[PDB]
Write a protein that binds this ligand. Structure first.
Ligand SMILES: CO[C@H]1[C@H](O)[C@@H](O)[C@@H](O[C@H]2[C@H](O[C@@H]3CO[C@@H](O)[C@H](O)[C@H]3O)OC[C@@H](O[C@@H]3OC[C@@H](O)[C@H](O)[C@H]3O)[C@@H]2O)O[C@@H]1C(=O)O
Ligand SMILES: [K+]
Ligand SMILES: [Mg+2]
Length: 397
């Protein structure tokens, strides 16, 4: 059975938004940091540098302004960096208005999100699984290879900018990637083994998303107060943790994030804690390994991570055949987080069990399940865009 988000660690019943925001949220944040994702050792580093390396006002046949930006995490040119790609809808810019933004990481490099031949090929290590990679280096045959997950033209046509960063800029997704990571640089522990409570890939990815947001604040073309942070699967685990830690994010989307994302760990279904740490030992804190086949001992579950987004709108979604992500456990996490959203006057899914396919349910706390296998599809995006329209525009200038 689940720990109650609205009962403090000392048994105090949380009945008001101030106690939630100033006592219970820090408690839960610290528990997830120590026991699941590992500690984020700092937020914004001193000396971040933003360098716009390319800027095309007539990208995508004139539909967008495209910018590529090197976001460096310190002033020394020897500091680590990530490469941000930004498409801004020219229809909005031309009205002298700032665009809201969808922001999320990509799996295989910025050049894979769109065929746009002007995108810089990632110069970083790319996993063997990437489509049409050669020797773990980016090739131009990989251009647009992950475009199915990225309906850029539709997003732009609906009035949103699209921003993305390759997750491997921050931590290459391989069990040894943390030694070639942002974590490796910030790790001043001269020692070898990362500490038990030290962050892994998901914490490093989530931190990169907040650094992307830092950049968007400075970019005059976009409204960084209206950023929807989104991710698919492992990068949706990152999007949830980024959205929970960084309340500047206006809206958070978890597309089939599964185990250690939206799915309840204490529900033993599909991927389990032991399975995810065995296969992906770099993703979480070593402390999370304490809960291998010991989920009953977890002091939190993922409904409390969802609750860390409240009262900002949160969308959790599943795929019908995606048993490994445990769709029912993702839905039940939403339902167990709902009392925190309700504390702030927001509403979650109507009813007690999984809604029917392609029938989203909920107010600011929303869920859908779509037909088909694990993935991120045009149907998901259709629902996300309607959600963003409601929460980043409705009664807004
Ligand atoms: C939910 O996000 C993550 C999961 O946390 C990961 O476990 C991983 O899940 C995928 C699974 O991954 C394998 C688990 O078994 C291990 O032995 C193996 O080494 C892992 O590679 O692979 C199957 C995949 O579902 C497939 O997705 C595509 C869909 O078209 C197919 O029908 C599915 O079978 C599952 O996601 O990766 C997840 C992620 O996407 O980040
Ligand atoms: K801005
Ligand atoms: Mg599970």
């Amino acid at each position: 059975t689940l720990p109650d988000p609205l009962v403090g660690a000392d048994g105090t019943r949380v009945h008001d938004r101030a106690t939630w925001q100033h006592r219970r949220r820090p408690e839960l944040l610290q528990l997830f940091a120590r026991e699941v994702y590992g500690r984020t050792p700092l937020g914004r580093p001193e000396g971040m540098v933003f360098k716009v390396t390319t800027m095309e006002h007539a990208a995508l046949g004139g539909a967008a302004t495209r910018k590529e930006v090197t976001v460096r995490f310190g002033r020394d040119p020897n500091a680590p960096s990530m490469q941000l790609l930004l498409y801004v809808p020219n229809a909005v810019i031309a009205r002298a208005e700032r665009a809201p933004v969808f922001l999320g990481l990509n799996f295989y490099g910025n050049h894979t999100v769109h065929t746009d031949p002007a995108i810089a090929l990632s110069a970083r290590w790319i996993p063997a699984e990437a489509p049409n990679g050669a020797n773990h280096r980016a090739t131009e045959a990989a251009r647009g290879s992950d475009a199915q997950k990225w309906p850029v033209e539709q997003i732009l046509a609906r009035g949103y900018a699209v921003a993305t960063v390759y997750c491997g800029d921050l931590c290459p997704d391989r069990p040894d990637g943390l030694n070639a990571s942002v974590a490796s640089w910030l790790d001043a522990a001269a020692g070898d083994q990362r500490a038990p409570d030290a962050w892994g890939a998901i914490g490093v990815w989530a931190w990169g998303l907040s650094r992307a947001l830092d950049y968007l604040e400075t970019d005059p073309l976009v409204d960084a107060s209206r950023v929807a942070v989104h991710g698919h699967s492992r990068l949706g685990k990152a999007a949830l943790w980024a959205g929970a830690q960084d309340d500047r994010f206006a809206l958070v989307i978890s597309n089939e994030s599964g185990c250690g994302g939206a799915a309840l760990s204490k529900r033993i279904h599909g991927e389990t804690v032991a399975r995810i740490n065995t296969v992906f030992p770099h993703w979480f804190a070593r402390n999370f390994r304490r809960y291998d086949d010991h989920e009953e001992a977890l002091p939190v579950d993922q409904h409390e991570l969802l609750a860390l987004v409240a009262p900002r709108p949160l969308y959790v979604a599943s795929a019908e055949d995606d048993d490994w992500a445990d769709p029912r456990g993702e839905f039940l996490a939403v339902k167990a987080a709902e009392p925190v959203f309700r504390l702030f006057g927001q509403t979650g899914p109507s009813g007690e069990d999984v809604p029917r396919v392609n029938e989203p349910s909920g107010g600011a706390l929303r869920y859908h399940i779509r037909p088909g296998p694990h993935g991120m599809t045009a149907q998901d995006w259709a629902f996300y865009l309607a959600f963003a329209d409601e929460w980043l525009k409705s009664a807004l200038p």
